[PDB]
Amino acid sequence: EFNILLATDSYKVTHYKQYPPNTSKVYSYFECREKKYEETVFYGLQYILNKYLKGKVVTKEKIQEAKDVYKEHFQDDVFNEKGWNYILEKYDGHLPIEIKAVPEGFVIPRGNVLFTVENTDPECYWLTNWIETILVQSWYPITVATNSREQKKILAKYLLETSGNLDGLEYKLHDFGYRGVSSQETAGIGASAHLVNFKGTDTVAGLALIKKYYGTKDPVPGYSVPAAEHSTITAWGKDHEKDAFEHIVTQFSSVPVSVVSDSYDIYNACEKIWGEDLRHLIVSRSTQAPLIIRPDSGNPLDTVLKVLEILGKKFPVTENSKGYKLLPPYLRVIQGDGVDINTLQEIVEGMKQKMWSIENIAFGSGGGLLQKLTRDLLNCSFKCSYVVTNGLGINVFKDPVADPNKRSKKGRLSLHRTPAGNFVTLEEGKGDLEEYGQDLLHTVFKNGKVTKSYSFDEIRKNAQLNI
């Protein structure tokens, strides 16, 4: 089905004719360039290696298919049929490429090499950057995992300040983004990246991806709870919202249940329906099976604060040991509308200023978590840094006059820890001097084989917060 010969940017089809004659090696690297988001979670390359790059990826039929498409697409014969046939005949269609990468889950400051790519056969000098397009899509799981982890840092800071511990942190940011991403494939990739940091998800696609490509000791990497949507409330008719609420919390009386409460009037629902008519069905619930009230409209901070004020007047509020107000354990709130890293910060800060514990609230995020992200957020970039031409290696780079931020690194690269425990990327082959301890890049792919793999449990450990 998938054809790697048709999985590149069109212009790359023409690059084999553009490199210097007598070029035997093209060596390229990926970084999140330096320019907020000072460090990045490296995640997602193992998916790409296994799904698209390993094994026999070239066949006679795929070559003919590409040749025919490109003849029409370019209105010209430019496709390197010879070079692809070489890989087919010499290597049984396995890519003569070596990729070295930092371990998945590692948290690396901006401006460092995260992986490198080079050809292992001199005839395939053109192949290194053929697969740039595929490999650069690693920007997306890196950026989802990174932005999710930055939200975890905010939640952890405010949970610690308002409650004194981090209990429940892993469930405080729930993935609501399945319908809000651009494809089924993106849903799985993005949901898996969020699960590097959290355990709550409604994007089921992430589970199958992690099981197939990474693996966990536990049966599943992420969990959900029963929850209403507007259709299951509004189907009862507007005059029967109370009947809908009563039915749903009674069907799910012994597990947590989230009930969207803003179909008609969130404030009436909290004060009169939950707070009076159905109060007897709430105060009876277990600490392990709270009602979770879900507003879903209005200004996010103003709505959360007004919902909490209403609930604190109808239910017995305590003051925890840090001085912050706490709803009874059978009652919680989830804000799932308009949540991104900026509004999450605004809400928890507003709660803190009004003396509400972050224990009371959880968040759901859809587009903000999985779709409202681009390759430019972390300046994810893949560039050639080293070539061998006429048997001599030369260090190559770009350095555009009008934008020093786009200057790329020179020569053969390696990643090291510094004496102070930070990270440094050495350029120009200087890692070979061995002044800086071991290279942290490891070979993960060579000549069609995935050579080093990480479980999802290892990745989660590598991506832990300091605290």
Ligand X SMILES: O=C(O)c1cccnc1
Binding-site residues for beta-nicotinamide D-ribonucleotide:
202, 294-296, 336-337, 367, 375
**Nearer Cβ to its own copies, position 184 or 422?**
184
- Name residues whose C-beta falls within 8 Å of residue 248's C-beta, 6 or more positions apart in sequence: 226, 228, 232, 257, 259
User: Any contact of residue 427 with ligand PRP (CB under 6 A)?
Assistant: no
Q: Interior CA angle at 55 toward 51 and 58, to 5°? A: 100
DSSP for 205-259?
A: HHHHHHHHHT--SSS-S-B---B--HHHHHTT-GGGHHHHHHHHHHHTSSS-EEE
Among residues 50, 43, 52, the alpha carbon closest in space to that of 189 is found at 43
Q: What angle do CA 357, 359, 360 make, to 5 degrees?
A: 80
Residue 234 lies near ligand PRP (rule: CB under 6 A): no
Closest separation in Å from C-beta 399 to its own copies: 6
The three-class DSSP label of residue 292 is strand
Interaction between residue 31 and ligand PRP (CB under 6 A): no
Burial 238-254 (b: 16+ CB within 10 A, else e): eeebeebbbebbeebee
Minimum distance of its own copies from residue 324's CB (angstroms):
26
Under rule CB under 6 A, residue 227 binds ligand X = yes
Q: 459: burial class by Cβ within 10 Å (0-12, 13-18, 19+)? A: buried
Q: For its own copies, give the closer residue by CB, 307 or 326.
A: 307
Neighbours of 75 (CB within 10 A): 8
**Beta carbon of residue 237, minimum distance to ligand X (angstroms, whole number):** 21
The answer to the question of residue 366 lying near ligand PRP (CB under 6 A) is yes
Residue closer to ligand PRP, measured from CB, 60 or 398: 398
Q: Does 365 bind ligand X (CB under 6 A)?
A: no
Which one among 11, 72, 419, 421 touches ligand X, defined by CB under 6 A? 11
Strands 97-101 vs 414-417: parallel, antiparallel or unpaired: unpaired
Q: Which does 112 bind (CB under 5 to 8 A by kind): ligand PRP, ligand X, its own copies, none?
A: none
How far is residue 85's CA from residue 58's CA, in Å, rounded to a whole number?
8
Residue 259 makes contact with ligand X by CB under 6 A: no
Minimum distance from residue 74 beta carbon to its own copies (Å) = 6
Any contact of residue 176 with ligand X (CB under 6 A)? yes
Amino acid at 26: V
- Least distance from ligand PRP to the Cβ atom of residue 180, Å: 4
Q: How many amino acids of this chain bind ligand PRP (CB under 6 A)? A: 15
User: What H or E segment, with its residue span, contains residue 445?
Assistant: strand 442-446
Q: Of 382 and 445, which CB lies nearer to ligand X in the complex structure?
A: 382
Contact 47, 141 (CB under 8 A): yes
Q: Which does 346 bind (CB under 5 to 8 A by kind): ligand X, ligand PRP, its own copies, none?
A: none
Q: Does 35 bind ligand PRP (CB under 6 A)?
A: no
Q: Can you give the binding site for ligand X, defined by CB under 6 A?
A: 9, 11, 176, 202, 227, 258, 336, 364
Q: Can you give the binding site for ligand PRP, defined by CB under 6 A?
A: 176, 180, 296, 336-337, 339, 365-368, 375-376, 379, 381, 406
